[PDB]
Design an enzyme around this catalytic site. Structure first.
Site, PDB file in Angstrom:
ATOM      1  CB  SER A 532      -5.890   3.767  -9.463  1.00 39.39           C
ATOM      2  OG  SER A 532      -6.540   4.072  -8.253  1.00 39.39           O
ATOM      3  CG  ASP A 617      -0.229   1.429  -0.602  1.00 40.64           C
ATOM      4  OD1 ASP A 617      -0.783   2.304   0.149  1.00 40.64           O
ATOM      5  OD2 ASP A 617       0.303   1.687  -1.704  1.00 40.64           O
ATOM      6  CG  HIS A 652       6.525   1.003  -1.556  1.00 40.25           C
ATOM      7  ND1 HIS A 652       6.401   1.862  -0.471  1.00 40.25           N
ATOM      8  CD2 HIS A 652       5.376   1.129  -2.262  1.00 40.25           C
ATOM      9  CE1 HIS A 652       5.221   2.450  -0.505  1.00 40.25           C
ATOM     10  NE2 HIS A 652       4.572   2.014  -1.594  1.00 40.25           N
TER      11      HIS A 652
END
Length: 677
Positions: A532, A617, A652
């Protein structure tokens, strides 16, 4: 061998401050995530990754199995007591989800099930428990659950008398809620229907139609996170409003009907403060007088009445505190170590908590009851698995409550060091490293250098069981405590963000060079990883110092920095002007563009690289890494491995992917170990 995927080029010009950037892969962004040419490129790259890594299947199995083999299947949490009941969390090897149990404090034998995640998840595609709390009167259970994988939490209420549920659901919540002291009224945070940012506080009567809920407060500035807290005293529910730089707290009387929010101290740019209430006083952690924070005591809100308990110190960062009957306990950072200090309310006696390890972390753990001399605190180090201690604040008696169990592990097989590196500007950068003793020979071991270095988040040195799979194969594992992290307090953060962001990347390079120069590793087998904002780090470092690293793993990397930060339609952008800057200003546009990894990809040799992302996501949006790989494939002059692995999952479904976290770690480690061979 194999021809990699080649993304179509569709020149998309972006002009800012008279500067035209041509983005050939702007089209890989599809906010709907259905464009079939976008999916065809992501799928092509996954099939390329599957094909290129197929020989590493045996190694990925060996890694997966040895990682799961370290772990005890049958986990029981340390019991804690709150409002006269004892609570335990239990994992069975059968079960996907935790079971939460409790019993009266004076009971031993029998435990009541509060909530069984496996039962809640029955006939659902997805399940995450976001919050659990019993009412003050021990009669009702409030739970925040996500059944849809969007981090929008539903709050539901269970009558513990007969295990029946009430009929209502509070929908699209942050999962943040507090009970009023009547055990009948709950305050909760509602997310914005479009941005999903937390922005409204509602009051709900349990059992009733949520149509009846009263809007208590609405935050006008969506850079301000909205959370709820409850004071140690139980006297107030806190509306906690904060941006990256600025706080504001409103008080709700937790005892009386029809409470409205009472201002504590009105927001002022660059004043961050948080409060608690206990012993008829407010306690305030505030940066009003110094960036490293102080602790204050007040009888009232008025900032001019705040009495100094702990003055801000340049050498000591104040991170947090807990309040007990006879003691204040604070969490601090000094000289690159975390520390706890206790101060007696009456005597002023100060004690420090002693350790003997060069690379450890200590923290305040869960202490829900203040009327005690017993402090719970955590400890972990690069050589010692994570431990919960209970300390008698008066007697100094330290008792272990829980150790992380690590099978097939002998701690004396490993050694750790703290290393300080003088960076190119003369600033001292701390490093924490660990390696297996019996396979260490100076200058010969592969290095894995890990960094993050944003938001003042610290990569505090702690134990990792999965890390043993690298250590037991000759790796020296390194945490580089680079600027932009928080290891040396607020100034360490501020000297790695905005117009100092390049210090993050320079520190990572300076640390890596120093460790090779000092004989910690093989110059030819240096690896790095970050995710990230740590992927921004990976992206900048390989543009700037491509020859330093053999191989890189960049997880969900923030790399399209200028284009993303010019577009408020991207989640995060409106909240990250105080991290990177606002490139609508020419000064920030030039400073950011200089390191923005996507923009600075050049026709030069790069290390081997595995890049990961996820379609469905969020966080960093999937397109940034996919554009970055497309551009690297177009321009890079080497013949090394470049792979993009996109998580296609619907979600998930397993809490957040238990099995799957170990599968991902196995695939990344196999990639790196294959390169080191």
């Amino acid at each position: 061998h194999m021809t990699p995927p080649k993304a179509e080029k569709r020149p998309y010009p972006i002009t800012t401050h008279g500067d035209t950037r041509v983005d050939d892969y702007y089209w890989l962004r599809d906010d709907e995530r259905t464009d079939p040419q976008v999916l065809d490129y992501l799928q092509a790259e996954n099939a390329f990754t599957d094909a290129a890594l197929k020989p590493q299947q045996a190694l990925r199995e060996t890694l997966y199995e040895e990682m799961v083999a370290r772990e005890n299947l049958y986990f029981q949490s340390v019991p804690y007591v709150r409002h006269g009941y004892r609570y335990q969390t239990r994992f069975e090897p059968g079960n996907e989800y935790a079971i939460y149990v409790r019993q009266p404090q004076a009971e031993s034998e029998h435990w009541d099930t509060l909530i069984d995640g496996n039962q809640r998840a029955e006939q659902r595609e997805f399940y995450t428990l976001g919050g659990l709390e019993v009412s003050p009167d021990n009669q009702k259970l409030a739970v925040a659950e996500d059944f849809l994988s969007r981090r929008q939490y539903d709050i539901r209420f269970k009558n513990l008398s007969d295990d029946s549920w009430t009929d209502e659901v509070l929908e699209n919540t942050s999962g943040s809620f507090e009970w009023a002291n009547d055990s009948a009224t709950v305050y909760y945070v509602r997310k914005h229907a479009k941005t999903l940012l937390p922005y409204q506080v509602y009051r709900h009567v349990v059992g009733t139609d949520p149509q009846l809920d009263e809007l208590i407060y609405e935050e006008q500035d969506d850079t301000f996170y909205v959370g709820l807290e409850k004071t140690t005293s139980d006297r107030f529910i806190l509306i906690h409003l904060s941006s990256t730089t600025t706080s504001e707290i409103l008080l709700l009387d937790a005892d009386r009907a029809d409470s409205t929010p009472q201002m504590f101290v009105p927001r002022r740019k660059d004043h961050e403060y948080g409060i608690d209430h206990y012993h008829q006083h407010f306690y305030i952690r505030s940066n009003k007088d110094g960036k490293n924070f102080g602790l204050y005591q007040s009888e009232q809100a008025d900032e001019a009445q705040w009495q100094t308990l702990i003055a801000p110190r340049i050498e000591v960062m104040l991170e947090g505190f807990s309040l007990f009957r006879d003691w204040l306990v604070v969490e601090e950072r000094s000289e690159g170590l975390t520390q706890l200090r206790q101060i007696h309310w009456q005597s002023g006696e100060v004690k420090r908590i002693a350790f003997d390890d060069p690379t450890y972390t200590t923290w305040l753990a869960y202490n829900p009851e203040p009327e005690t001399e017993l402090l719970r605190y955590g400890y972990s180090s690069m050589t010692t698995p994570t431990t919960l201690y209970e300390l008698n604040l008066d007697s100094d008696e330290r008792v272990m409550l829980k150790q992380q169990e690590v099978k097939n592990f002998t701690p004396e097989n490993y050694r750790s060091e703290r290393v300080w590196v003088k960076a190119r500007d003369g600033v001292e950068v701390p490093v924490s490293l660990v390696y297996r003793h019996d396979s260490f020979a100076r200058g010969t071991n592969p290095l894995m250098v890990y960094g993050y270095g944003s938001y003042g988040s610290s990569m505090d040195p702690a134990f990792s069981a999965s890390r043993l799979s690298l250590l037991d194969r000759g790796f020296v594992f390194v945490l580089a405590h680079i600027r932009g992290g928080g290891e040396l307090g607020q100034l360490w953060y501020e000297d790695g963000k905005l117009f100092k962001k390049q210090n993050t990347f320079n520190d990572f390079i300076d640390v890596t060079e120093a460790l090779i120069a000092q004989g910690y590793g093989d110059a030819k087998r240096v690896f790095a990883m970050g995710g990230s904002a740590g992927g921004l780090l990976m992206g900048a470092v390989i543009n700037q110092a491509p020859e330093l690293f053999n191989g890189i793993v960049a997880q969900v990397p923030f790399v399209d920095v200028v284009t993303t930060m010019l577009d408020e339609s991207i989640p995060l952008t409106t909240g990250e002007y105080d991290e990177w800057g606002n490139p609508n200003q020419q000064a920030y546009y030039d400073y950011i563009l200089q390191y923005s990894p996507y923009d600075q990809v050049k026709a030069q040799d790069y290390p081997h690289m595995l890049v990961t992302t996820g379609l469905h996501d969020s966080q960093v949006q999937y397109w940034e890494p996919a554009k970055w790989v497309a551009k690297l494939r177009e321009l890079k002059t080497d013949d090394r491995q470049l792979l993009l692995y996109t998580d296609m999952d619907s979600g998930h479904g397993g809490k957040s992917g238990r099995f799957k976290a170990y599968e991902d770690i196995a695939l990344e480690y196999a990639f790196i170990l294959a390169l080191a061979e």
